[PDB]
Ligand binder design. Structure first.
Ligand SMILES: *[C@@H]1O[C@H](CO)[C@@H](O)[C@H](O)[C@H]1NC(C)=O
Ligand SMILES: *[C@@H]1O[C@H](CO)[C@@H](O)[C@H](O)[C@H]1NC(C)=O
Ligand SMILES: *[C@@H]1O[C@H](CO)[C@@H](O)[C@H](O)[C@H]1NC(C)=O
Ligand SMILES: *[C@@H]1O[C@H](CO)[C@@H](O)[C@H](O)[C@H]1NC(C)=O
Ligand SMILES: *[C@@H]1O[C@H](CO)[C@@H](O)[C@H](O)[C@H]1NC(C)=O
Ligand SMILES: *[C@@H]1O[C@H](CO)[C@@H](O)[C@H](O)[C@H]1NC(C)=O
Ligand SMILES: *[C@@H]1O[C@H](CO)[C@@H](O)[C@H](O)[C@H]1NC(C)=O
Lengths: 124, 654, 296, 109, 98, 50
């Protein structure tokens, strides 16, 4: 049973930085089998992929959001963290941490196990 | 009572029968690794055999009196039994029904019962002479259908000396042995494939050995082919990360190729009008072709028949026709003759297979089979895979024919006269030519190979549509165009590939590797060493708990030992100090190492000398008031040895 | 490929001889540098007051600001020569992804060809040159023969004028003119090094020859040498054991010949480099540590 | 970029509905790597289809996937009130990146 | 003390020993012993194996001679330096520094 | 082979049938009938200068 739990702050003013963190239980991120990605769902709009990290530290970011984004991983604590800066009314969304299977464990390029989601609100 | 202890340097035996004296000889064989963990049984389940067994016993009472080897240890399978009688030794390979706890009872007659209930269907017999404290050592190997036994007896005060085991007996018994048991405190160890450096003294005795894979110092000794090492840094073998898995990625193709209708055709085409069939979008099992026609063997060019099931092709072509036997040699690249010039031409760069078989019973008639024809006359040679089915009158002479045959106006086609009484060179032969198209466009014909999962970010063996290799697969940002299936680099090695099922582009990177250097003071000073992993970051230094995922088998604990990161690589086992000394052992990029006082190996930034502020000023001069007469030595080579080579004697002897 | 390795074992000690020759060359390079630059028993330093009879040594004396402590002219020279591979650390990421394809160094490394760093760093060599310069301008030629004996720089120049057969009153009565001429000549050297783009041709030639030899060695891996393919994996996946062994033997013989050619050319070029280094060490002894009477 | 998906689709019980998802020639028309996700309200998205037309273990066979040209399609046969969610399409866009659809609101009458 | 002269001697001895040890290489032949090849095989196949051995041993001789020529050039440069030092340091007093 | 055969003082062990040297050439052999050890030496040879 693989579980993903988010604990980041959900109240961030504009021109600040997010500090979202997602811990994983039931699996070792240090195994390198999966990628670990952050996906945002704004209200009204559809899902948006922000980026992904791998145990070795390699990352792949959404080209539009690449400038102001950083995704890191701690294998010691079995978690990965998202930092989105230049926060603006566009950034208020439900943020999920999700396990991505890159064909290494069966399913090819499928986001299978999703986190509960944290509502990040942007206001002064 | 199973305990565990250390084998030290025991268990070395003579690898062969060749006499050698005052030499160092390197041998790769099944040896008991130095300082291995052996099991001490003070005693009964049956122990495994593995690749080979080292057996030791310090007993004096002669209670241990033989061994049992086999797989099932029952009458279902043959089993080897060795019994050391008080006067002789008897070895048998009968099918014994061994007891669960066999042992030899004495009551003086020594009963062979209580070991086995029965000995049926015997197949071998052998009798010979029977085999402080007296340590007795044996090595049992089962290779090449041969059971080899080496042995030795040593007086002791497992000692830490050296004692080689002479070949005691060799038995030509081809039996399976995976388990063994002793017959009534003994030590049992297991052999591994190892390279040893053995020292033969003047009398021919092996008096010392070096286990190359034991540790960095032993690897240095094996590389230098010496038992002593001078102070310095030595480039030993390179570390390589070994692949964990093997992956196969083939296109999803379900249909079976219709080769049976190619081979099992009622009538074949004439060679001038040879039949061509296209094979595509199917799974091709080439091992079943042997069942369709009674041909003796394939004749393949650029490929081997037994490999055809591991490959994928864009398209396959099957060309079928009939010729006579003495023309079968013409169906080959770079050939000349009537068939090759005017009927069927293979390309010079042909990759494929030719299958020809005698068809006298089907293509011959008592009156002569005239249905099969060949072109005899043509103005020019055919191009490869070009078909000419014209029937125009051939104009050999300058006089025109006007479409009517005659003298110098021959009809271009002539008929074979296949008859059952002809010799084999004139009998009909049915020919099928398989032409393979490799690489380029996506494959549509593949062998019966099951596709695994596509594993990324790990060092794996990979097989993409027959393109094999080893490396790490990652997502690629190379902008492959839709028609492009793989990418190459300067060395003409594939570095990118399109996955046949997902159609994504994958980068292929070599698995982690690099050079290894061993830093040592003289072995006359210490056995401690440091290890430099050249041009690698200390974070990427190979740490491999498993012995099959890295080539250097010895392990120096990276985190455990001192770790320093120089621009020449990661140094493990030397402590970095902030003092500066004159360079002793050069590491590189200003870093040197030395064995210094507890004494250990220390790394340091080398010193260029002491600073000297010169008391310069506008009007100050230093003048010497005395002098020293100095005498110094300079040594210069002038000549070297003059050598002569008898070229013929060196190359050819006499 | 283990099949290829087992076949290559049958050719004896050719690989070990090649490795030994390359190791000899590598050690000789550090020996060359040490013989040229480590000609000083102490790291001499000038006093903080930098007046030497009006001669301006500022562009050749060390610049304490920069991390390398190089002089201005040494900075110009260092920027004038572009090295192909320094021998320092290369991590995963520089040879992964789309960056390997645009770099020949990654292909060289992936095919077993690496560069070792020099024992002496550039900073250490600059320290040696600054010690030599400080010794020369503070003590003349005395530090080459024993302890550095300080002497005023104008008086040292008077000594040197005597060395070429000119009376020293000529130096003393023309001291300002001689200092100005030297300052202008140094400025011309600096301007020429700043402006002209190909002054250091010989060093660039050494670098280019090494890079070309390595690139030729890498490109030789795409030769078939009479085999069906230049790729061992294709041969092993397309052919059975015996015919694959034949093709692999052809590839082994060709690649062994290419390695032997590379090592032989390296030995010859190393001998030429060693002769140049011996000349440089002689010039350091006889032109820097003393005044020479040898014409030209 | 985004994959053009209809804002909402509707259907009656027992009938199949086809949801489309159109991308460019470099994401949907370049790979067999189309995924479908279902979002019930107050929950996290759940993968229902991967690799265009493959079913994750424990997914009902009534959710069929297909691809034609630069468009992907999800077919729901035997529609019921259980299939009342928001349906998103995802495609691998190359270079390790992904593009998601706008989302379709399925309503059951 | 006399490291350079010992190095010259050692290099010569090592080159000769390597040349001798190269005679145990098979170079792709069935055997490194010509007598075994000639006693085990007929004329044509023995000729093939012998050609392999000949090519390998010829290459080893060529490598030895090339390395000898290069080392001889180095030794000649050292000898020319020694003769210059005999002329200028023993037969006269030198002004050349060092 | 070809050479001169002499009595050998090499201490062959009973299981050993021949001896080899550095160049992997047989330099000692056990006689199959008498079981004695014989040294094998190359026949006399040498360079000639005019
Ligand atoms: C012994 O039997 C096992 C199967 O139980 C087989 O895998 C193995 O190859 C056999 N070994 C020999 C030497 O016959
Ligand atoms: C060889 O044997 C003799 C006795 O025959 C003995 O004196 C000598 O020490 C032995 N050689 C070695 C190396 O021990
Ligand atoms: C080793 O890796 C770490 C983390 O990737 C990096 O910060 C460091 O610079 C590397 N070592 C060197 C010598 O660059
Ligand atoms: C050398 O100095 C550094 C501080 O720059 C310190 O971290 C290190 O521990 C010192 N090493 C020793 C051996 O004292
Ligand atoms: C040396 O002479 C120069 C030039 O006159 C002068 O500037 C400097 O102060 C003098 N140094 C001392 C220590 O008097
Ligand atoms: C010069 O040195 C020698 C030996 O070092 C010493 O005996 C002698 O007294 C010294 N002469 C003077 C004048 O200092
Ligand atoms: C020495 O030369 C530099 C550069 O040409 C110049 O800036 C500096 O002023 C000069 N020093 C003196 C004392 O003129």
């Amino acid at each position: 049973q693989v579980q993903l739990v988010q604990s980041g702050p959900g109240l961030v003013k504009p021109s600040q930085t997010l500090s979202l963190t997602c811990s994983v239980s039931g699996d070792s991120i240090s195994s390198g089998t999966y990628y670990w990605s952050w996906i945002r769902l704004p209200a009204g709009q559809g899902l948006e992929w922000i980026g992904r990290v791998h145990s070795s530290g390699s990352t792949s970011y959404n080209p539009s959001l690449k400038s102001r984004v950083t995704i890191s991983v701690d294998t010691s604590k079995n978690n990965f963290s998202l930092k989105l800066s230049s926060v603006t009314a566009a950034d208020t969304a439900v943020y999920y941490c999700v396990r991505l299977d890159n064909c290494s464990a069966g399913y090819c390029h499928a986001f299978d196990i999703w986190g509960q989601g944290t509502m990040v609100t942007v206001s002064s | 009572t199973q305990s565990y202890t250390n084998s030290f340097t025991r268990g070395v035996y003579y690898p062969d029968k060749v006499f050698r004296s005052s030499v160092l000889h390197s041998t790769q064989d099944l040896f008991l690794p130095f300082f291995s963990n052996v099991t001490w049984f003070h005693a009964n389940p049956v122990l495994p055999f593995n690749d080979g067994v080292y057996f030791a016993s310090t007993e004096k009472s002669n209670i241990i009196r033989g061994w049992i080897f086999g797989t099932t240890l029952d009458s279902k399978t043959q089993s080897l039994l060795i019994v050391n009688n008080a006067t002789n030794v008897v070895i048998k390979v009968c099918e014994f029904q061994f007891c669960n706890d066999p042992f030899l009872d004495v009551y003086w007659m020594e009963s062979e019962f209580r070991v086995y209930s029965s000995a049926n269907n015997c197949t071998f017999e052998y009798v010979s002479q029977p085999f402080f404290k007296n340590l007795r050592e044996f090595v049992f190997k089962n290779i090449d259908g041969y059971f080899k036994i080496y042995s030795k007896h040593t007086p002791i005060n497992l000692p830490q000396g050296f004692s080689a085991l002479e070949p005691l007996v060799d038995l030509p018994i081809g039996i399976n042995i995976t388990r063994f048991q002793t017959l009534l405190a003994y030590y049992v160890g297991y052999l591994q494939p190892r390279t040893f450096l053995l020292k033969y003294n003047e009398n021919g005795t092996i008096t010392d050995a070096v286990d190359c894979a034991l540790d960095p110092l032993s690897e240095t000794k094996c590389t230098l082919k010496s038992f002593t090492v001078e102070k310095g840094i030595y480039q030993t073998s390179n570390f390589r990360v070994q692949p964990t898995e093997s992956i196969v990625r083939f296109p999803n193709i379900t249909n079976l190729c219709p080769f049976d209708e190619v081979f099992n055709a009622t009538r074949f085409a004439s060679v001038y009008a040879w039949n061509r069939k296209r094979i595509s979008n199917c799974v091709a099992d080439y091992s079943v072709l042997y069942n369709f026609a009674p041909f003796f063997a394939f004749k393949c060019y650029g490929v081997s028949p037994t490999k055809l099931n591991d490959l994928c092709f864009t398209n396959v072509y099957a060309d079928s026709f009939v010729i006579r036997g003495n023309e079968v040699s013409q169906i080959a690249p770079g050939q000349t003759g009537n068939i090759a010039d005017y009927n069927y031409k293979l390309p010079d760069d042909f990759t494929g297979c030719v299958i020809a078989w005698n068809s006298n019973k089907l293509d011959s008639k008592v009156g002569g089979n005239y249905n099969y024809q060949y072109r005899l006359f043509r103005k020019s040679n055919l191009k490869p895979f070009e078909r000419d089915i014209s029937t125009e009158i051939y104009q050999a002479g300058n006089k025109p024919c006007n479409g009517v045959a005659g003298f110098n106006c021959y009809f271009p086609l002539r008929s074979y006269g296949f008859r059952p009484t002809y010799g084999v060179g004139h009998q009909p032969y049915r020919v099928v030519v398989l032409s393979f198209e490799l690489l380029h466009a996506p494959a549509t014909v593949c062998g019966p190979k099951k596709s695994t999962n596509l594993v990324k970010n790990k060092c794996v063996n990979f097989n993409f549509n027959g393109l094999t290799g080893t490396g790490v697969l990652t997502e690629s940002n190379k902008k492959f165009l839709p028609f492009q299936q793989f990418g190459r680099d300067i060395a003409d090695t594939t570095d990118a590939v399109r996955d046949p099922q997902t159609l994504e582009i994958l980068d292929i990177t070599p698995c982690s590797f690099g050079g290894v250097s061993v830093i040592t003071p003289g072995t006359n000073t210490s056995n401690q060493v440091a290890v430099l992993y050249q041009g690698v970051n200390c974070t990427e230094v190979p740490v491999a708990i498993h012995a099959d995922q890295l080539t250097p088998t010895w392990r120096v604990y990276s985190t455990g030992s001192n770790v320093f990161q120089t621009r020449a690589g990661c140094l493990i086992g030397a402590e970095y100090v902030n003092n500066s000394y004159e360079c002793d052992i050069p590491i590189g990029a200003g870093i040197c190492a030395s064995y210094q006082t507890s004494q250990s190996i220390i790394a340091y930034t080398m010193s260029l000398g002491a600073e000297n502020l010169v008391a310069y000023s506008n009007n100050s001069i230093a003048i010497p008031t005395n002098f020293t007469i100095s005498v110094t030595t300079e040594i210069l080579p002038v000549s070297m040895t003059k050598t002569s080579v008898d070229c013929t004697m060196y190359i050819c002897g006499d | 490929s283990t099949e290829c390795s087992n076949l290559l074992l049958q050719y004896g000690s050719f690989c070990t001889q090649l490795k030994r020759a390359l190791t000899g060359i590598a050690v000789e390079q550090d020996k060359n540098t040490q013989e040229v630059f480590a000609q000083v028993k102490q790291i001499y330093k000038t006093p903080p007051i930098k007046y030497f009879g009006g001669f301006n040594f500022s562009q050749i004396l060390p610049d304490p600001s920069k991390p390398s402590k190089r002089s201005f002219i040494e900075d110009l020279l260092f920027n004038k020569v572009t090295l192909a591979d320094a021998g320092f650390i290369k991590q995963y990421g520089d040879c992964l992804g789309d960056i390997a394809a645009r770099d020949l160094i990654c292909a060289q490394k992936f095919n077993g060809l690496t560069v070792l760093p020099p024992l002496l760093t550039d900073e250490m060599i600059a320290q040696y040159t600054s010690a030599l310069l400080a010794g020369t301008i503070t003590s003349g030629w005395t530090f080459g023969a024993g302890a550095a004996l300080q002497i005023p720089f104008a008086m040292q120049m008077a000594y040197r004028f005597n060395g070429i057969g000119v009376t020293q009153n000529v130096l003393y009565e023309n001291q300002k003119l001689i200092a100005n001429q030297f300052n202008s000549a140094i400025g011309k050297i600096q301007d020429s090094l700043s402006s002209t783009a190909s002054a250091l041709g010989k060093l660039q030639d050494v670098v280019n020859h090494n890079a070309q030899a390595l690139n030729t060695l890498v490109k030789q891996l795409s030769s078939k040498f009479g085999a069906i393919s230049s790729v061992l994996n294709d041969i092993l996946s397309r052919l059975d054991k015996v015919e694959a062994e034949v093709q692999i033997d052809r590839l082994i013989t060709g690649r062994l010949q290419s390695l032997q050619t590379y090592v032989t050319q390296q030995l010859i070029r190393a001998a030429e480099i060693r002769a140049s280094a011996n000349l440089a060490a002689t010039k350091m002894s006889e032109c820097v540590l003393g005044q020479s009477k040898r014409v030209d | 970029s985004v994959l053009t998906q209809p804002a909402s689709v509707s259907g009656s019980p027992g009938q199949s509905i086809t949801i489309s998802c159109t991308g460019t020639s470099s994401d949907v028309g370049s790979y067999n790597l189309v995924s479908w996700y279902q979002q019930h309200p107050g929950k996290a998205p759940k993968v229902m289809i991967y690799e265009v037309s493959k079913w994750p273990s424990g997914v009902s066979n009534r959710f069929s996937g297909s691809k034609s040209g630069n468009t992907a399609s999800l077919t729901i046969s035997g529609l019921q009130a259980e299939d009342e969610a928001d349906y998103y399409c995802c495609s691998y866009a190359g270079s390790g990146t992904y593009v998601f659809g706008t989302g379709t609101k399925v309503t059951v009458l």
